[PDB]
Every structure is written in C-alpha cells, then in structure tokens.
Curated annotation (Swiss-Prot), chain A:
Name assigned to this protein: Beta-lactamase inhibitory protein
Job description of the protein: Inhibits a wide variety of beta lactamases.
Entry GO CC: extracellular region
Resulting phenotype, K74A: Decreases binding affinity for K.pneumoniae beta-lactamase SHV-1 and E.coli beta-lactamase TEM-1
Mutagenesis or variant effect for S130K: Increases binding affinity for K.pneumoniae beta-lactamase SHV-1. Decreases binding affinity for E.coli beta-lactamase TEM-1
Effect of E73M: Increases binding affinity for K.pneumoniae beta-lactamase SHV-1 and E.coli beta-lactamase TEM-1. Decreases binding affinity for K.pneumoniae beta-lactamase SHV-1 and E.coli beta-lactamase TEM-1
Primary residence: secreted
Keywords, ordered alphabetically: Disulfide bond, Repeat, Secreted, Signal
UniProt-annotated location(s): Secreted
Sequence repeat positions: 1-76, 80-164
Length: 164, 261
C-alpha cells in the first residue's frame, strides 16, 4: 500500500479513532510519542529536507480519542495556483475565507492545518492555508508561497515568501 | 581523487568531502577548503550553541517558548503542531536537528542573537570559516560564488569533531548533542546509506532546493573502531540542477574506502 499520500489524507476524517487513522495511512508510515506526543505523524516521500507528511491530533491521549486536527505539507496540490505578490497585498485581516479565496485565486490554496479545539463543536476553529503562485508548488521547494491563517473563518494574519 | 572527479562530473556539479579517522588520524579530502552552502545543516551547530549557552544560563533548555502563527514557516512539522501550547528550548532543539524544523530553528536563532550570534559561537570553538548570515528560509538561496550562509567540508568536520568527541561542550551537553544527532530522521539516504547497518551514525542534513545544493555531516562509529567524522557537501552551476542524495551517499562510500573502512 505504499507511503502516506494525499488520497489517504483526504480519506481520513475528523472524528476518526487512532486505529482508523493507522489503518488508512499504513502503520509502517507513522510514528507517535517522542517529538509528537500523542499525535500520529505519517510520512510520504522525501521532499524539502524532510518528507511530505501528515499529522493527526486527537482530543486526548485516551485510546478512544478522536481526530480533532489535520495538518499536511506536500501531500495535496493546489488545483490552479495563481497567487501573486499583488494579490497577497490585497488580502486583509478581517476578511472571510470566501473573500480571501476570491482575492488569491479559488484554486491557489491547500489546507496546511485545520484544528477544532472544542471538537465536536466547530467554535474556535483555526485554519492555516498554504497558497501558491503558478510555479510555487513543486520537490517541496516552493517558488513563491504564502501562509494565510484564520480563526472562526476570519483572517487573522498573513505571511509570504518569494512572491512577485 | 579520480573517483571524486568522475562522480562530480556525472552529477554535473561540485562535490566537497572531508573525512577524519579519529583513531589513526588518517583523512580524505576533496575540495575540502571550498565554500558550500550550509542549508539546514546549520541547525546541528545551532543546537550545539544552545547546549553551550545552557552551561552559562541555568534552566535554558526547560524554558517554555510561546509563539503564534506569524512565527511559522514552511517545513515546520513539530512547531506547527505545538503552536497552541508552545515548546521548550530543548524540544525546539530536538525538532530543528531531527526533523529539520524551520520555525523551531528561527526561534532558537532568536534566543542566540541571530545568525551573527551562531557565527560568533562557531568562531569561539576555533572555526574561522563558518558563517551564517540569514534566517530560514532565505538562507537557502545557494547562489554560486555567494559566501553568505556557507562553510567548508573541512571546517564542518573539524567543528563537528570538537562538539561531539572533543571538549567544546561539557560532558552532559556533549552526550545530549550526540543523542540528538543519533536520532535524526532525515538522513537515511545520505551518509547512513553508505555504511553497514550495524554502525551507529549521528548526522544532520541540509537541502537548499536549488543549484544542485544539498549535504550531510556525521559521526560514524564503525564496529570495533574509533569514530570517523565526515562531511559531504554538493552544489551545481544551474538554478534548476537538482541535488542527488545518491551522489552524497556515493561520495561517502569513497571517503570511507579512502580511510580503509
């Protein structure tokens, strides 16, 4: 069944148990404990100076705990990357997710992290998007990307690297 | 020598190697005085600098660091996950060394007075070559002939030996540094790929992502022999030349063969 993949990441749902996560990701791809505590971290192929990866957080250390957090880098590709430095500069704190997407491009972004601190409640949801310019998603070494972050669906801040 | 030249020709760039057998004193050297970009390999020395500072600042490693999302940068597997609770200086150091965590490395650089602070620590152990000039991710540009964020294979190896096997760190700190390098997760296709599976290795990798530029340095403990310390760095003339882990591992095999191991 191979390494961790975007397909597997998408198959995994908020609310799943530790065993359901391992069964989908492939236990040999995953680790827990150590630097990750009681989260489960799952590796794909080499990229950057590390690996494409997913990280799954759980409501507690309990065995019956549920997935309340999904993070990934380099597992999911943006469908149509059109972010530019100019579009980045038009994004403003206080924008909705919808407003941000219209500004940076509807297919420019993937979900870097999504966390529900009150799971199963969606109150206080925090979200990081990773957004890319036309050749920004690669190898794991991006040619112009941005991080856009939200709380309760409202943009809290933004940062970019190498945009033009 | 001839083998290194052939390997680097196939690669389409330049390879830098320096290896020392701490038992015999033998060495192997190819472009060992030339500058190569450090990339993320600077993070091992950063952890060592943090350890040295803890010798003069009680409780440093246990100090909790709080940060928000503005501190995040791509390739930050550990720090991204602990955002809501913060991480200790020790946890940041483990993440920077073993997972090449970017935001963790920046947080630690800030603790040490930035790139200049790290460079000053390296000067303090007698390394006159090492320079860190920028932060993650800008330090990865790897422009040919740019001296920013570079060292030489010999300087890397000499400093690595001082920190892991010599007296540059006090004993407890030195063991902690060794333990972190031994637990690195990013080096399986590099120096570790060049040696028998029963030899213990601690290493730190670097990968710039442009200009064929990547590297690895390591302390290797062959069965029944004194440790070997070595560094393998690569670079290439075109921005779109890709690095090759196999080339790093091959050069590592040549080095060990060169010391007769």
């Amino acid at each position: 069944a191979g390494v961790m993949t975007g397909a597997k990441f998408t198959q995994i749902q908020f609310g799943m148990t530790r065993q359901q996560v391992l069964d989908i990701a492939g236990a040999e791809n995953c680790e827990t404990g150590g630097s990750f505590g009681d989260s489960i971290h799952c590796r794909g192929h080499a990229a950057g100076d590390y690996y494409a990866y997913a990280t799954f957080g759980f409501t507690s250390a309990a065995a019956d705990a549920k997935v309340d957090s999904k993070s990934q880098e380099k597992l999911l590709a943006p469908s149509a990357p059109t972010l530019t430095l100019a579009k980045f500069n038009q994004v403003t704190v206080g924008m909705t997710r919808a407003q941000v997407l219209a500004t940076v491009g509807q297919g420019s972004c993937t979900t870097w992290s999504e966390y529900y601190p009150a799971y199963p409640s969606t109150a206080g949801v925090t979200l990081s998007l990773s957004c890319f310019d036309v050749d920004g998603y690669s190898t794991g070494f991006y040619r112009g990307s941005a991080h856009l972050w939200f709380t309760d669906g409202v943009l809290q801040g933004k940062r970019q690297w190498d945009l033009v | 020598a001839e083998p290194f030249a052939k390997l680097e020709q196939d690669f389409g760039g330049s390879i830098g190697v320096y290896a020392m057998d701490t038992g015999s004193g033998a060495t192997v050297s190819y472009r060992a005085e030339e500058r190569f970009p450090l990339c993320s390999s600077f993070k091992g020395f950063l952890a060592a600098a943090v350890l040295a500072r803890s010798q003069q600042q009680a409780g440093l490693l246990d100090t909790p660091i709080r940060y928000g999302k503005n501190a995040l940068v791509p390739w930050s597997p550990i720090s991204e996950k602990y955002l809501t609770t913060g991480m200790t200086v020790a946890e940041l150091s483990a993440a920077a060394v073993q997972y090449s965590d970017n935001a963790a490395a920046n947080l630690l650089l800030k603790e040490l007075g930035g790139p200049a602070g790290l460079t000053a620590f390296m000067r303090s152990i007698g390394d006159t070559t090492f320079r860190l000039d920028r932060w993650e991710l800008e330090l990865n540009s790897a422009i040919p002939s740019d001296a920013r964020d570079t060292s030489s294979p010999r300087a890397v190896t000499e400093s690595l030996q001082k920190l892991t096997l010599g007296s540059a760190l006090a004993a407890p700190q030195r063991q902690q540094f060794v333990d972190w390098l031994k637990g690195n997760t990013t080096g399986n296709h590099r120096i570790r790929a060049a040696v028998p599976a029963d030899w213990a290795v601690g290493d730190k990798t670097g990968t710039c992502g442009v200009y064929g530029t990547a590297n690895d340095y390591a302390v290797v403990w062959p069965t029944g022999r004194a440790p070997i310390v070595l560094a393998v760095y690569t670079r290439a003339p075109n921005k779109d030349d890709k690095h090759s882990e196999a080339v790093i591992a091959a050069a590592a095999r040549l080095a060990l063969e060169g010391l007769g191991v």
